[PDB]
Amino acid sequence: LVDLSFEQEFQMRVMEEQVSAMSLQEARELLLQASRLLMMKDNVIRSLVKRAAR
Amino acid sequence: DLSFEQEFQMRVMEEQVSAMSLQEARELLLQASRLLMMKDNVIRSLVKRAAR
């Protein structure tokens, strides 16, 4: 199971602080850095689930 | 290491962002941040079956 802890909810309130004062350029570079990171995360997971089975 | 399908999605993503409003670019940056944490939780789980 996986869902947001207390402190991560805190982290979400902080990112929201810093995003609201972001320029169009900064929000776009970071979002792209985030989307790429999301895919590299799927790969760590997939690779971890395989490595457990076998 | 992005697979071949992922590199491709990236390109589609560079093309969407570049057209995004400052408004959507923010909403979505948050969502992606939530997701990264959710995925980090999943990764932490699977690593915990380190119970051996």
Coordinates of N, CA and C in Angstrom, one line a residue:
Chain A
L1 N 0.9 -1.2 0.0 CA 0.0 0.0 0.0 C 0.9 1.2 0.0
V2 N 0.4 2.3 -0.6 CA 1.2 3.5 -0.8 C 0.3 4.6 -1.0
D3 N 0.5 5.6 -0.1 CA -0.4 6.8 -0.1 C 0.3 7.8 0.8
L4 N 0.0 9.1 0.6 CA 0.7 10.2 1.4 C 0.7 10.3 2.9
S5 N 1.9 10.2 3.5 CA 2.1 10.3 4.9 C 1.9 11.8 5.4
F6 N 2.0 12.0 6.7 CA 1.8 13.3 7.3 C 2.8 14.3 6.7
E7 N 4.1 14.0 6.9 CA 5.1 14.9 6.4 C 5.1 15.1 4.9
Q8 N 4.7 14.1 4.1 CA 4.6 14.4 2.7 C 3.5 15.3 2.3
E9 N 2.4 15.3 3.1 CA 1.3 16.3 2.9 C 1.9 17.6 3.2
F10 N 2.9 17.7 4.1 CA 3.5 18.9 4.5 C 4.3 19.4 3.3
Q11 N 5.0 18.4 2.7 CA 5.8 18.7 1.5 C 4.9 19.2 0.3
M12 N 3.7 18.7 0.3 CA 2.8 19.1 -0.8 C 2.4 20.5 -0.6
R13 N 2.2 20.9 0.7 CA 1.8 22.3 1.0 C 3.0 23.2 0.7
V14 N 4.2 22.7 0.8 CA 5.4 23.6 0.5 C 5.6 23.7 -1.0
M15 N 5.5 22.7 -1.7 CA 5.7 22.7 -3.2 C 4.7 23.7 -3.7
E16 N 3.5 23.7 -3.2 CA 2.4 24.6 -3.6 C 2.8 26.1 -3.3
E17 N 3.6 26.3 -2.3 CA 4.0 27.6 -1.9 C 5.0 28.1 -3.0
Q18 N 5.9 27.3 -3.3 CA 7.0 27.6 -4.3 C 6.5 27.6 -5.8
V19 N 5.4 26.9 -6.1 CA 4.9 26.8 -7.4 C 4.2 28.0 -7.8
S20 N 3.4 28.6 -6.9 CA 2.5 29.7 -7.1 C 3.3 31.0 -7.4
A21 N 4.6 31.0 -7.1 CA 5.5 32.2 -7.4 C 6.5 31.8 -8.5
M22 N 6.1 30.8 -9.3 CA 7.0 30.3 -10.4 C 6.7 31.0 -11.7
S23 N 7.7 31.3 -12.5 CA 7.5 31.9 -13.8 C 7.1 30.8 -14.8
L24 N 6.6 31.2 -16.0 CA 6.2 30.3 -17.0 C 7.3 29.3 -17.4
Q25 N 8.5 29.9 -17.5 CA 9.7 29.1 -17.9 C 10.1 28.1 -16.8
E26 N 10.2 28.6 -15.6 CA 10.6 27.7 -14.5 C 9.6 26.5 -14.3
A27 N 8.3 26.8 -14.3 CA 7.3 25.8 -14.1 C 7.3 24.8 -15.3
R28 N 7.7 25.2 -16.4 CA 7.8 24.3 -17.6 C 9.1 23.4 -17.5
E29 N 10.2 24.0 -17.2 CA 11.4 23.2 -17.1 C 11.2 22.1 -16.0
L30 N 10.8 22.5 -14.8 CA 10.6 21.6 -13.7 C 9.6 20.5 -14.0
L31 N 8.4 20.9 -14.6 CA 7.4 19.9 -14.9 C 8.0 18.8 -15.8
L32 N 8.8 19.3 -16.8 CA 9.5 18.3 -17.7 C 10.4 17.5 -17.0
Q33 N 11.1 18.1 -16.0 CA 12.1 17.3 -15.2 C 11.3 16.3 -14.3
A34 N 10.1 16.7 -13.9 CA 9.2 15.9 -13.1 C 8.6 14.7 -13.9
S35 N 8.1 14.9 -15.2 CA 7.5 13.9 -16.0 C 8.6 12.9 -16.4
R36 N 9.8 13.3 -16.7 CA 10.9 12.4 -17.0 C 11.1 11.5 -15.7
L37 N 11.2 12.1 -14.6 CA 11.4 11.4 -13.3 C 10.3 10.5 -13.0
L38 N 9.1 10.8 -13.4 CA 8.0 9.9 -13.2 C 8.3 8.6 -13.9
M39 N 8.7 8.7 -15.2 CA 9.0 7.5 -16.0 C 10.2 6.7 -15.5
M40 N 11.2 7.3 -14.9 CA 12.3 6.6 -14.4 C 11.9 5.9 -13.1
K41 N 10.8 6.4 -12.5 CA 10.3 5.8 -11.3 C 9.6 4.5 -11.6
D42 N 8.8 4.5 -12.7 CA 8.1 3.4 -13.2 C 9.1 2.2 -13.4
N43 N 10.3 2.6 -14.0 CA 11.3 1.7 -14.3 C 12.0 1.1 -13.1
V44 N 12.1 1.9 -12.0 CA 12.7 1.3 -10.8 C 11.7 0.3 -10.2
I45 N 10.5 0.6 -10.2 CA 9.4 -0.2 -9.7 C 9.3 -1.5 -10.5
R46 N 9.1 -1.4 -11.8 CA 9.1 -2.6 -12.7 C 10.2 -3.5 -12.4
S47 N 11.4 -2.9 -12.5 CA 12.7 -3.7 -12.2 C 12.8 -4.3 -10.8
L48 N 12.0 -3.8 -9.9 CA 12.0 -4.2 -8.5 C 11.0 -5.4 -8.3
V49 N 9.9 -5.3 -9.1 CA 8.9 -6.3 -9.1 C 9.4 -7.5 -9.8
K50 N 10.1 -7.4 -10.9 CA 10.7 -8.5 -11.6 C 11.6 -9.2 -10.6
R51 N 12.6 -8.4 -10.2 CA 13.7 -8.9 -9.3 C 13.1 -9.6 -8.0
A52 N 11.9 -9.4 -7.7 CA 11.3 -10.1 -6.5 C 10.8 -11.4 -6.9
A53 N 10.0 -11.4 -8.0 CA 9.4 -12.6 -8.5 C 10.5 -13.7 -8.8
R54 N 11.5 -13.3 -9.6 CA 12.6 -14.3 -9.9 C 13.7 -14.1 -8.9
Chain B
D1 N 17.1 5.3 -17.1 CA 17.2 4.9 -18.5 C 15.8 4.7 -19.1
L2 N 15.4 5.8 -19.8 CA 14.1 5.8 -20.5 C 14.1 4.8 -21.7
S3 N 13.1 3.9 -21.7 CA 12.9 3.0 -22.8 C 12.7 3.8 -24.0
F4 N 12.5 3.1 -25.1 CA 12.2 3.7 -26.4 C 10.8 4.4 -26.5
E5 N 9.9 3.7 -25.8 CA 8.5 4.2 -25.7 C 8.5 5.5 -24.8
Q6 N 9.3 5.5 -23.8 CA 9.4 6.6 -22.9 C 10.0 7.8 -23.5
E7 N 11.1 7.6 -24.2 CA 11.8 8.7 -24.9 C 10.7 9.4 -25.7
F8 N 10.0 8.6 -26.4 CA 8.9 9.1 -27.3 C 7.9 9.9 -26.6
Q9 N 7.4 9.4 -25.4 CA 6.4 10.1 -24.6 C 7.0 11.5 -24.2
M10 N 8.3 11.4 -23.8 CA 9.0 12.7 -23.4 C 8.8 13.7 -24.5
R11 N 9.1 13.3 -25.8 CA 8.9 14.3 -26.9 C 7.5 14.8 -26.9
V12 N 6.5 13.9 -26.8 CA 5.1 14.3 -26.8 C 4.9 15.3 -25.6
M13 N 5.6 15.0 -24.5 CA 5.5 15.9 -23.3 C 6.1 17.3 -23.5
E14 N 7.3 17.3 -24.2 CA 8.0 18.6 -24.4 C 7.1 19.5 -25.3
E15 N 6.3 18.8 -26.2 CA 5.4 19.5 -27.1 C 4.2 20.0 -26.4
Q16 N 3.7 19.4 -25.3 CA 2.5 19.8 -24.6 C 2.9 20.9 -23.6
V17 N 3.9 20.8 -22.9 CA 4.4 21.7 -21.9 C 4.6 23.1 -22.6
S18 N 5.4 23.0 -23.7 CA 5.7 24.2 -24.5 C 4.4 25.0 -25.0
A19 N 3.3 24.4 -24.8 CA 2.0 25.1 -25.2 C 1.2 25.4 -24.0
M20 N 1.6 24.9 -22.8 CA 0.9 25.1 -21.6 C 0.8 26.5 -21.1
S21 N -0.3 26.8 -20.4 CA -0.5 28.1 -19.8 C 0.3 28.0 -18.4
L22 N 0.6 29.2 -17.9 CA 1.3 29.2 -16.6 C 0.4 28.5 -15.5
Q23 N -0.9 28.6 -15.8 CA -1.9 28.0 -14.9 C -1.9 26.5 -14.8
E24 N -2.0 25.9 -16.0 CA -2.0 24.4 -16.1 C -0.6 23.9 -15.7
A25 N 0.5 24.6 -16.2 CA 1.8 24.2 -15.9 C 2.1 24.1 -14.4
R26 N 1.4 24.9 -13.6 CA 1.5 24.8 -12.2 C 0.6 23.7 -11.6
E27 N -0.6 23.6 -11.9 CA -1.5 22.6 -11.4 C -0.8 21.2 -11.6
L28 N -0.4 21.0 -12.9 CA 0.3 19.7 -13.3 C 1.6 19.5 -12.6
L29 N 2.3 20.6 -12.3 CA 3.7 20.4 -11.6 C 3.4 19.8 -10.2
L30 N 2.3 20.2 -9.6 CA 1.9 19.8 -8.3 C 1.5 18.3 -8.4
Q31 N 0.6 18.0 -9.3 CA 0.1 16.7 -9.4 C 1.3 15.7 -9.6
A32 N 2.3 16.1 -10.4 CA 3.4 15.3 -10.7 C 4.3 15.1 -9.4
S33 N 4.2 16.1 -8.6 CA 5.0 16.1 -7.3 C 4.3 15.1 -6.4
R34 N 3.0 15.1 -6.3 CA 2.2 14.2 -5.5 C 2.6 12.8 -6.0
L35 N 2.4 12.5 -7.2 CA 2.7 11.2 -7.9 C 4.1 10.7 -7.6
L36 N 5.1 11.6 -7.6 CA 6.5 11.2 -7.4 C 6.6 10.6 -5.9
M37 N 5.8 11.2 -5.0 CA 5.9 10.8 -3.7 C 5.1 9.5 -3.5
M38 N 4.0 9.4 -4.2 CA 3.3 8.1 -4.1 C 4.2 7.0 -4.7
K39 N 4.9 7.2 -5.8 CA 5.8 6.2 -6.4 C 6.9 5.9 -5.5
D40 N 7.4 7.0 -4.7 CA 8.5 6.8 -3.8 C 8.0 5.8 -2.7
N41 N 6.7 6.0 -2.3 CA 6.2 5.1 -1.3 C 6.1 3.7 -1.8
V42 N 5.7 3.5 -3.0 CA 5.7 2.2 -3.6 C 7.0 1.6 -3.6
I43 N 8.0 2.3 -4.0 CA 9.4 1.8 -4.1 C 9.9 1.4 -2.7
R44 N 9.6 2.2 -1.7 CA 10.0 2.0 -0.3 C 9.3 0.7 0.2
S45 N 8.1 0.4 -0.2 CA 7.4 -0.8 0.1 C 8.2 -2.0 -0.4
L46 N 8.2 -2.1 -1.7 CA 9.0 -3.2 -2.4 C 10.4 -3.3 -1.9
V47 N 11.0 -2.2 -1.4 CA 12.3 -2.4 -0.9 C 12.2 -3.0 0.5
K48 N 11.2 -2.7 1.2 CA 11.0 -3.2 2.6 C 10.9 -4.8 2.6
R49 N 10.3 -5.4 1.6 CA 10.3 -6.9 1.6 C 11.8 -7.1 1.4
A50 N 12.6 -6.6 2.3 CA 14.1 -6.7 2.4 C 14.1 -7.5 3.7
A51 N 12.9 -8.0 4.1 CA 12.7 -8.7 5.3 C 13.1 -10.2 5.0
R52 N 14.4 -10.3 4.8 CA 15.1 -11.6 4.5 C 16.6 -11.2 4.3

